[PDB]
Amino acid sequence: MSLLLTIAKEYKRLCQDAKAAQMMTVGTVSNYTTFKKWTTSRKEKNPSLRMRWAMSSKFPIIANKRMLEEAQIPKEHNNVALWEDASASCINYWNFCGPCVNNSEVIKEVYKSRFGRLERRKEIMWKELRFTLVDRQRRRVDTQPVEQRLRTGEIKDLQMWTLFEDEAPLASKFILDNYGLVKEMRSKFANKPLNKEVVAHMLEKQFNPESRFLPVFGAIRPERMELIHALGGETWIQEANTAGISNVDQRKNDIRAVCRKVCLAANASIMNAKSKLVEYIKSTSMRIGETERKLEELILETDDVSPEVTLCKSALGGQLGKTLSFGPMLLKKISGSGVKVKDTVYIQGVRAVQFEYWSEQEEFYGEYKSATALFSRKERSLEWITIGGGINEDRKRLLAMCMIFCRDGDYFKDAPATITMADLSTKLGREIPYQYVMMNWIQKSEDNLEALLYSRGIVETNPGKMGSSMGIDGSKRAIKSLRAVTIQSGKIDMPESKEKIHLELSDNLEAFDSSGRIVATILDLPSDKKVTFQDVSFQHPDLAVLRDEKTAITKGYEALIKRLGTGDNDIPSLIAKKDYLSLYNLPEVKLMAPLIRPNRKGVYSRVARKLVSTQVTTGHYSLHELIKVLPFTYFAPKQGMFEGRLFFSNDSFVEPGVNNNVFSWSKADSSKIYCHGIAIRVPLVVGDEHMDTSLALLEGFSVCENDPRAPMVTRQDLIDVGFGQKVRLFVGQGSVRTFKRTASQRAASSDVNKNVKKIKM
Amino acid sequence: IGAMSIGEAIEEKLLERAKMKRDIGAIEDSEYEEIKDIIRDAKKARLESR
Amino acid sequence: SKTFAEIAEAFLEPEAVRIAKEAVEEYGDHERKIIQIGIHFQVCCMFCDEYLSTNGSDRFVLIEGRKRGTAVSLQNELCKSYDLEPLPFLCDIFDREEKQFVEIGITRKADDSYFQSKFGKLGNSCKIFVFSYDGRLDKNCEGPMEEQKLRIFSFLATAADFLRKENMFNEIFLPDNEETIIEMKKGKTFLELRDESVPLPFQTYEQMKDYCEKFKGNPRELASKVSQMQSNIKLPIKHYEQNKFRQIRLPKGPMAPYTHKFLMEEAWMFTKISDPERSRAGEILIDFFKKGNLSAIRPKDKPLQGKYPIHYKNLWNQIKAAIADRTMVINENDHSEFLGGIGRASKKIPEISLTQDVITTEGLKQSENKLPEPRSFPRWFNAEWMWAIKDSDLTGWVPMAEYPPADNELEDYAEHLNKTMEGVLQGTNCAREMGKCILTVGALMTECRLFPGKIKVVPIYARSKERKPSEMDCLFGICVKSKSHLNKDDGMYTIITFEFSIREPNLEKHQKYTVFEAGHTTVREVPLYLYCRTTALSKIKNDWLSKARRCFITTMDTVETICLRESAKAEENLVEKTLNEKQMWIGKKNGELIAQPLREALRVQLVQQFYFCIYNDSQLEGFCNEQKKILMALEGDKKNKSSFGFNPEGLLEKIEECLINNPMCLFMAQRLNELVIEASKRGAKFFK
RNA sequence: AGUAGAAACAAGGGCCUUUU
């Protein structure tokens, strides 16, 4: 308003100047950031003293005049200098009595993190303080329970698209994919009196899991690490049960299970395991709380250092940590080097089998359940191993898997009699190296493990070293103990390195990392297991258990949703032209008509043929209901009694209005259709009464060749633009572009892959 | 970030805001024309000056 | 994101990244271009959009991603089969339907320079499409399919946003064909210098670079040189057991004199019932003056000792007149001027106005820096310590907050320990001095801030509580502060301190003060003594004295570091037993080692921390930094660890260098010597 | 006078720069 005129006059005054005009004219807008530093640069060494100094002053505070005048609060209620025409005391007067905000219940959403902290803390049953020398391990962890953890780029787009839409940047992939989260955030913080910067900063903190390198004891869960300071120190422990707070392990566990399942499925195709794996990953999703997320993004966000996730991250191309693996064991190379060197091993009598072994000094941290180690190898020999675990069995298993890692012992020279050529290799036509065979051998029976440990030389426990010794049963001390097996108390501190290594994978799912090393494989996973996954979507033929009927209905609904794109002879355009009659002869309804229960098909068509008209003509319609009931409008109307439900030929119905398993939706997430527990994405080409907003149209538009003839419109006027009509539009900051309302988003990955495959012929 | 200068961004955004508030908000065609004329004068002055 | 490949995978598909990487490796060019080529390759593949010809067969055939060797082979094969003319240069795609090649290009600048150059090079032979990131197309023929255009322009828009975000939308990463050689702008002068910094053997950076890039290892020569350096050194190694630590030598001279601003042991105080309404400094001073005991004081002309008596007597009378007037502002007279040095600041002389004659008229020579002088061990410090380890007949001298609620056992334990320690520590005399410092310096801080340029009057007071009861305001003495115009950090502003006493002044100890016997006071009647000092302070000393409450934290930390450790070795709550029983040696008497529970050695610890706050200087810093070696040697001796060193004599010299005119340093050194002596009876590595 | 350190203050500009 008049303020606008003032802003324009100010701009005019500035441009009348010469220097400001020069700096504004030249360069791009980024210069602002730079200038933001050349100004207001001043700090102070001891701020505390300065504050005490200033507070004493006659009038320390600063307050805007217009706010004080608007408040109409007494100048000096009792001979107190609230302001010349301000003291700190003034704030007290305001707080005790003064202008009251209509409601302050929005603060609970702004600071959802801290209220969550308080809510979690109120449910902790404190048991009993005890005293003892706690064993603490210094390891990286996360100290904030967070849902839907994202990167800084996504967070930045979330803030811009939830607060400043008029200055929103061009629609990203994430915003289109995750529209339920953006809608949920937008609703709470729209048309509200708020300091926007504060809210943005708090959403940044909301979506950032604070990872720190700390001493730790006991379980590792963000719910505890946020208050670890009040659970135990080096000398005391305040017992407390924190199991049932913000369960974050069940979703990580489910993600790992799903990755295991897909990786085990996609090993069947010898020639095309990799491509099948990628296709399997892309055509799958899972529900997190309220929202449904694509598996690929979840895998990219996660930090689970496990062979399943490692392989999937490699396949998609995600970079991952410098973390090796060997079965259900963990490793981390502290130092050293080496180079492959082949050696033969006779399985039975004379049966040469080649195996490669590194040749150099090499230190290695290791981590098995409730045990840790710091071993070293040298030219096909286990030089030493220092353990700091706390369980006899975990200690033994760790030592054995470490020995195997380094191919030490006579068995590698002269294989045990028991192992045969049938199990050595080619379970499914793929060779299995010796080391994994020995691993399976040890897992198979304890006696083999005992034989392996016996293979390492045994000596007599010298005096003094009794405490630093390990028998065959993992005894703390004995009279005879394993050669060069030191033992100590206290978990070995986990190393740390903020490095990111690119690593590929072979046709046999062998993840190389810019060198020979095999970071992970499919032969270091549980054999197999059956699981019933909840709230997941395996939209792929091979990964499906349903019959042809519900699959056919779901396919028909997908086909109907495939005509929701832009262009004439389509549902949205026809609705704009109010030509409901054409909808009744669309190809997809003709394809879907056979399914419709023929006995009362006509009656169903009449009711739905009526509903669409009422929705279409009036201008108030439910897109979801329209898609739901278009299949019945193929046949000629008839006469009959309508019970209330529109059946198919498979004893599955849909009631017009109330969600059911066969067809569900929600006003919260209006971009999903749940057909028999299958998530069907609807494109965002046209808004509906509930979903109506700036976002529901973004997919339809796209950029095109610049044309200065087309008009310049507002963001809201986008709703009014014709299909296949060009228009210029300000986007983000300092960008004027041209948009054409035709959906053109073909698959980029598929085409690029195909061309690359062709390049190899 | 962009390719426009500061002046150009202010010019276009201000014009868009004025159009949005004349369309629906409490602004009169006279006020909209006055502001737009002021903006045109400011742009001309900025470019001509240096 | 530390390498370019990751940045390209952010938007580009990783496959195209690998392709462009292999291509760069084959050509041998910088890898900085992995992005540009990748973008071009992606544009072509997406451009193709699996389009088909009339024959239901593929329409576009790529030639770009293929290796150079097979590129010209496919090009010639196609130019021949369809009976086309061979082109001199290479292209990117071969449209079969129109039987002609199509090159593609991408120029950041919105100008036709690149298109013009490319068209000139290729003329009109084939179809060229010069896209632009900001929506511009330059061609020489009909435009492509609309879908193809909208996919190219969307991809380019996203890519330009993701570059502009990272500050990589420049010629460096997106150059044209010509501007492909980025290099540091080697200047004539920079080279002229670099060629002069090359070590003596070499004479040009080229020789040094050629010698370093090909440097090979010759361990024989390196080891020989190492041994020759290991022989011409003869590094001494000294196991302490054989070479013992001689006792520290302390300086010699007169006893170290009292330096703290406010008297502790001697100071005599006046009490008055607390008035909440009148809680201000001046209000308390006036109320104390009104009873009339203060107005009785009438110092004698002759002081017991000290100098400048007349000035002090005049200032005392002026202060009394000020209070009588209820205006605590002193006028600037000769006595105040002299004590405050208002005008005793040397006046700067310009150098341009100087001449040998001026030098002759008044002596002119570089300031003969008067380093401090050495003072011998103080024999009075022990008395102050013992006095400070006694109760003050009052409690709650230092203020405190209110303890918060509790929910878990741990909090109850913390609150019980804190309550016990605070109760023990609130009755002593050291805490009375803590309160006196906190309040007096707070008042003086809030005066120097408000009324600089006016020699205000501030009292030396405190607040306390009678044991179990009412509260009490105590008045140890009076202060004043000369102009505190603290324009800069770490300023300087003289103050003046009058304080009462009932004790005769020592000559060696109370050298600073200038006492005046002042009548009598009841308790029976007793003489009085008016101790008139003239000290100085700064901002930093003020803030730290006003935050002296820190000592409680350190003392509690030590006590609970001992109690939790003793409790863990037994896995049971052993704190009260440790506090009551555990005996801590705290001195010697009659040649024996005295010991008392921890509950009574908290007082010693607290006094130690307070004195660290008070007498802190560079000397104490250096000392406490150089004594650690000796304590580590002691521990090594206790555990029979054959410690050793290279030159202990130098260490002792360094230590004795930082012992000058600071009582605390000297006292602690004498105690350290007595410690090593007493331990020599049960340990080694120390000489007598 | 005093402070403290390995040099600086002991106001500077032309009349200005009270609640533990």
Q: Specify the nucleotide whose C1' lies closest to residue C541 (CA).
A: D3
Residue pair B50/A18 in contact (Cβ under 8 Å)? The answer is yes
DSSP per residue over A128-185, as a string?
EEEE-----EEEEEE-S--SS---HHHHHHHHHHHT-STTPPSPPHHHHH-HHHHHHH
Q: How far apart are CA C226 and CA A362, in angstroms?
A: 28
Q: How far apart are CA A221 and CA A243, in angstroms?
A: 9
The closest alpha carbon to A92, from A77, A103, A106, A105, belongs to A77
Q: How far apart are CA C444 and CA C463, in angstroms?
A: 16
Residue/partner pairs of C484-491 with CB below 8 Å, 24 or more apart: C484/C447, C484/C448, C484/C452, C485/C452, C485/C453, C486/C448, C486/C452, C486/C539, C489/A45, C489/C539, C490/C538, C490/C539, C490/C540, C491/C538, C491/C539
Output phi, psi for C127, to 5 deg: -90, 130
End-to-end Cα, chain C, rounded Å? 65
Dihedral sign for Cα atoms in the order A541, A545, A548, A551? negative
Q: Which two tokens stand for residue C147?
A: 């879908």
Helices (H), A596-703: 601-618, 623-629
Cβ–Cβ below 8 Å for A132 and C568: yes
What distance separates the 2 farthest-apart alpha carbons in chain C? 134
Judge whether residue C342 contacts strand D, using its CB and a 7 Å cut-off: yes
Question: From the CB of residue C674, how many other CB atoms can be counted at a distance below 10 Å?
Answer: 13
Q: How far apart are CA C217 and CA C223, in angstroms?
A: 11
Dihedral sign for Cα atoms in the order C245, C246, C248, C251? negative
Q: Give residue A506's identity as a one-letter amino acid code.
A: S
Q: Are residues A570 and A707 in the same domain?
A: no
Whole-angstrom CA distances from B1 to A71, A227, A669, A734 are 40, 41, 32, 7
State which residue of chain B sits closest to C164, comparing Cα positions: B1
| Domain-located, residue A118 | no
Q: Which two tokens stand for residue A597?
A: 């229960």
State which residue of chain C sits closest to B1, comparing Cα positions: C164
Residue appearing with tokens 């569900």: A664
Documented resolution in Å? 3.2
| Domain-located, residue A70 | no
- Which chains contact C through at least 3 pairs of Cβ atoms less than 8 Å apart? A, B
Chain C nearest C-alpha distance from B5 (Å): 14
In chain B, residues with a C-beta closer than 8 Å to the C-beta of C165 are 1
Q: Which two tokens stand for residue A390?
A: 């706390």
Judge whether residue C343 contacts strand D, using its CB and a 7 Å cut-off: yes
Residue pair A385/A373 in contact (Cβ under 8 Å)? The answer is yes
Domain C4-165: CATH class, spelled out: alpha beta
- Which chains contact B through at least 3 pairs of Cβ atoms less than 8 Å apart? A, C
| Domain-located, residue A396 | yes
Hey, which residues does C498 pair with through a beta bridge?
C478, C532
- Which chains contact A through at least 3 pairs of Cβ atoms less than 8 Å apart? B, C
Smallest Cβ–Cβ distance between B6 and the set A29, A716, A735 belongs to: A29
The SS3 assignment for C75 reads helix
The SS3 assignment for A618 reads helix
Q: Are residues A233 and A260 in the same domain?
A: no
Q: How far apart are CA C82 and CA C94, in angstroms?
A: 11
Query: What is the Rg, in whole angstroms, of the alpha carbon atoms belonging to chain C?
Result: 43
DSSP per residue over A533-600, as a string?
-SSEE--SSSS----HHHHHHHHHHHHHHTT-SSSSSSHHHHHHTT-HHHHTT-HHHHHHGGGB-GGG
Residue pair A700/A741 in contact (Cβ under 8 Å)? The answer is yes
User: Kind of pairing, strands C583-589 and C127-132?
Assistant: unpaired
Hey, which residues does C475 pair with through a beta bridge?
C270, C461
Q: Which two tokens stand for residue A739?
A: 């948009």
Smallest Cβ–Cβ distance between B41 and the set A5, A12, A736 belongs to: A12
Judge whether residue C346 contacts strand D, using its CB and a 7 Å cut-off: yes
Q: How far apart are CA A16 and CA A461, in angstroms?
A: 92
Q: Is A481 exposed, middle or buried (0-12, 13-18, 19+ CB in 10 A)?
A: buried
Domain assignment of residue A144, given as a range: 123-149+210-244
Question: From the CB of residue C175, how many other CB atoms can be counted at a distance below 10 Å?
Answer: 16
Q: How far apart are CA A548 and CA A531, in angstroms?
A: 23
Q: How far apart are CA A338 and CA A340, in angstroms?
A: 7
| Domain-located, residue A240 | yes
Which of the nucleotides in strand D have any atom less than 7 Å away from a protein CB atom? 1-12, 17-20
The SS3 assignment for A27 reads coil
Q: How far apart are CA A541 and CA A645, in angstroms?
A: 30
Q: How far apart are CA A197 and CA A159, in angstroms?
A: 10
In chain C, residues with a C-beta closer than 8 Å to the C-beta of A753 are 15
Q: Which two tokens stand for residue C227?
A: 């041994």
The closest alpha carbon to A134, from A221, A34, A22, A217, belongs to A217
Q: Are residues A168 and A226 in the same domain?
A: no
Q: Are residues A607 and A723 in the same domain?
A: no
In chain A, residues with a C-beta closer than 8 Å to the C-beta of B25 are 1
Q: Which two tokens stand for residue B15?
A: 């014009």
Q: Which two tokens stand for residue A513?
A: 């990392």
The single-letter DSSP state of residue C96 is: T
The SS3 assignment for C149 reads helix
Q: To which H or E segment does residue C102 belong? A: strand C100-107
Residue pair C567/C516 in contact (Cβ under 8 Å)? The answer is no
Q: Residue C434 contacts by C-beta under 8 Å, 6 or more apart in sequence?
A: C397, C398, C548, C549, C551, C610
Dihedral sign for Cα atoms in the order A163, A164, A166, A167? negative
Q: How far apart are CA C156 and CA A704, in angstroms?
A: 11
Judge whether residue C483 contacts strand D, using its CB and a 7 Å cut-off: yes
Interface of C with B (CB under 8 A): 134, 161, 164-165
Calculate ∠ Cα C410-C414-C417, nearest 5°: 135
Judge whether residue C86 contacts strand D, using its CB and a 7 Å cut-off: no
Q: How far apart are CA C434 and CA C552, in angstroms?
A: 11
Q: Are residues A458 and A414 in the same domain?
A: yes
Residue pair C47/C148 in contact (Cβ under 8 Å)? The answer is yes
Cβ–Cβ below 8 Å for C134 and B2: no
Q: How far apart are CA A116 and CA C460, in angstroms?
A: 50
Q: How far apart are CA A645 and CA A441, in angstroms?
A: 61
Q: Give residue A38's identity as a one-letter amino acid code.
A: W
Nearest residue (Cα to C1') for D2?
C535
Q: Give residue C375's identity as a one-letter amino acid code.
A: R
Hey, which residues does A241 pair with through a beta bridge?
A125
The closest alpha carbon to C443, from C278, C274, C283, C281, belongs to C281
Q: Are residues A145 and A166 in the same domain?
A: no
Calculate ∠ Cα A162-A168-A172, nearest 5°: 90
Chain C nearest C-alpha distance from A231 (Å): 9
Q: How far apart are CA A111 and CA A118, in angstroms?
A: 11
Hey, which residues does A663 pair with through a beta bridge?
A660
The closest alpha carbon to A504, from A515, A488, A493, A495, belongs to A515
In chain A, residues with a C-beta closer than 8 Å to the C-beta of C147 are 744, 746
What distance separates the 2 farthest-apart alpha carbons in chain A? 108
Interface of B with A (CB under 8 A): 1-10, 12-14, 16-21, 23, 25-27, 31, 34-35, 38-39, 41-43, 45-47, 49-50
Cβ–Cβ below 8 Å for B1 and C134: no
Q: Which residues of C325-352 are buried (b: 16+ CB within 10 A; e: fewer)?
A: eeebebeeeebbeebbeeeeeeeeeeee
Whole-angstrom CA distances from A328 to A308, A403, A520, C491 are 11, 15, 11, 66
Helices (H), A163-291: 173-177, 179-188, 196-206, 222-225, 249-265, 273-282
CA of A63 to C1' of D15 (A): 31
Question: From the CB of residue A12, how many other CB atoms can be counted at a distance below 10 Å?
Answer: 16
Question: From the CB of residue A22, how many other CB atoms can be counted at a distance below 10 Å?
Answer: 12
Binding residues of C for Mn(2+): 40, 64, 92, 103-104
Judge whether residue C463 contacts strand D, using its CB and a 7 Å cut-off: yes
Calculate ∠ Cα A117-A120-A126, nearest 5°: 120
Residue pair C193/C202 in contact (Cβ under 8 Å)? The answer is no
Cβ–Cβ below 8 Å for C46 and A756: no
Smallest Cβ–Cβ distance between A24 and the set B6, B17, B23 belongs to: B6
Cβ–Cβ below 8 Å for C65 and A756: yes
Domain count, chain A: 6
Q: How far apart are CA A425 and CA A642, in angstroms?
A: 66
The SS3 assignment for C237 reads coil
The SS3 assignment for C65 reads coil
Half-sphere exposure of A92 (CA within 13 A, CB side): 8
User: Kind of pairing, strands C127-132 and C520-521?
Assistant: unpaired
Whole-angstrom CA distances from A710 to A705, C3, C148 are 11, 42, 21
Nearest residue (Cα to C1') for D7?
C369
Residue appearing with tokens 């399943």: A308
DSSP per residue over C474-518, as a string?
EEEEEEEE------SSS--EEEEEEE-BSSPPPTTGGGS-EEE--
Q: Give residue C104's identity as a one-letter amino acid code.
A: I
State which residue of chain C sits closest to A314, comparing Cα positions: C14
The single-letter DSSP state of residue C627 is: S
Whole-angstrom CA distances from A134 to A231, A234, A235, C12 are 11, 5, 6, 49
Whole-angstrom CA distances from C527 to C80, C96, C511, C640 are 128, 122, 21, 59
Q: Residue C365 contacts by C-beta under 8 Å, 6 or more apart in sequence?
A: none
Task: Classify residue C428 as left (phi > 0), alpha (psi -120 to 50) or beta.
Answer: beta
User: Kind of pairing, strands A137-142 and A211-216?
Assistant: antiparallel
Cβ–Cβ below 8 Å for A4 and B14: yes
The closest alpha carbon to A623, from A572, A669, A577, A576, belongs to A572
Q: How far apart are CA C443 and CA C478, in angstroms?
A: 12
Q: How far apart are CA A705 and CA C141, in angstroms?
A: 16
Cβ–Cβ below 8 Å for B3 and C165: no
Dihedral sign for Cα atoms in the order A533, A538, A543, A549? positive
Smallest Cβ–Cβ distance between A744 and the set C151, C410, C567 belongs to: C151
Q: Specify the nucleotide whose C1' lies closest to residue C343 (CA).
A: D10
Dihedral sign for Cα atoms in the order C530, C535, C537, C543? negative
User: Any CB–CB contact under 8 A between A706 and chain B?
Assistant: no
CA dihedral A168, A171, A172, A174 (to 10 degrees): 90
CA of C569 to C1' of D2 (A): 55
Q: Residue A464 contacts by C-beta under 8 Å, 6 or more apart in sequence?
A: none
In chain A, residues with a C-beta closer than 8 Å to the C-beta of C576 are none
CB pairs under 8 A between A and B: 101
Half-sphere exposure of C243 (CA within 13 A, CB side): 11
Q: How far apart are CA C294 and CA C314, in angstroms?
A: 16
Task: Classify residue A246 as left (phi > 0), alpha (psi -120 to 50) or beta.
Answer: left
Q: Residue A466 contacts by C-beta under 8 Å, 6 or more apart in sequence?
A: A477, A478
How far from the centroid of its chain's Cα atoms is residue A330's Cα?
23
Judge whether residue C359 contacts strand D, using its CB and a 7 Å cut-off: no
Dihedral sign for Cα atoms in the order C556, C557, C561, C562? negative
- Of A473, A490, A507, the residue that ends a domain is A490
| Domain-located, residue A394 | yes
Q: How far apart are CA C682 and CA A125, in angstroms?
A: 52
The single-letter DSSP state of residue C628 is: H
Q: To which H or E segment does residue C241 belong? A: none
| Domain-located, residue A69 | no
End-to-end Cα, chain B, rounded Å? 24
DSSP per residue over A277-291, as a string?
HHHHHHT-EEEETTE
Q: Are residues A363 and A465 in the same domain?
A: yes
The closest alpha carbon to A252, from A288, A218, A281, A282, belongs to A288
Cβ–Cβ below 8 Å for C16 and A752: yes
Chain A nearest C-alpha distance from C75 (Å): 14
Q: How far apart are CA A427 and CA C66, in angstroms?
A: 38
Whole-angstrom CA distances from C259 to A611, A704, C509, C546, C660 are 98, 83, 9, 18, 13
Chain A nearest C-alpha distance from C586 (Å): 27
Q: Which two tokens stand for residue A714?
A: 């507002």
Hey, which residues does A354 pair with through a beta bridge?
A344
Q: Are residues A398 and A343 in the same domain?
A: yes
Q: Are residues A480 and A408 in the same domain?
A: yes
Q: Residue C375 contacts by C-beta under 8 Å, 6 or more apart in sequence?
A: C251, C253, C254, C255, C256, C257, C660, C661, C666
Q: Are residues A469 and A330 in the same domain?
A: yes
Q: Which two tokens stand for residue C124?
A: 């009109």
CA of C304 to C1' of D11 (A): 35
Q: Are residues A236 and A288 in the same domain?
A: no
Residue/partner pairs of C335-343 with CB below 8 Å, 24 or more apart: C335/C310, C335/C311, C336/C455, C336/C482, C338/C308, C338/C311, C339/C308, C339/C311, C339/C312, C339/C315, C339/C482, C339/C494, C339/C496, C339/C534, C340/C455, C340/C482, C340/C483, C340/C494, C340/C496, C341/C482, C341/C494, C342/C482, C342/C483
Q: To which H or E segment does residue A310 belong? A: helix A307-316
What distance separates the 2 farthest-apart alpha carbons in chain B? 38
Best residue of A1, A3, A9, A15 to probe chain B, by most B CBs closer than 10 Å: A15
User: Any CB–CB contact under 8 A between A736 and chain B?
Assistant: yes
CA dihedral C60, C63, C65, C68 (to 10 degrees): 180
The single-letter DSSP state of residue A704 is: -
How far from the centroid of its chain's Cα atoms is residue A297's Cα?
5
Q: Are residues A417 and A354 in the same domain?
A: yes
Method: cryo-EM
End-to-end Cα, chain A, rounded Å? 67
Nearest residue (Cα to C1') for D6?
C371
Output phi, psi for A703, to 5 deg: -85, 155
Q: How far apart are CA A187 and CA C34, in angstroms?
A: 42
| Domain-located, residue A160 | yes
- Tally DSSP H helices, then E strands, for chain C: 25, 19
The SS3 assignment for C331 reads coil
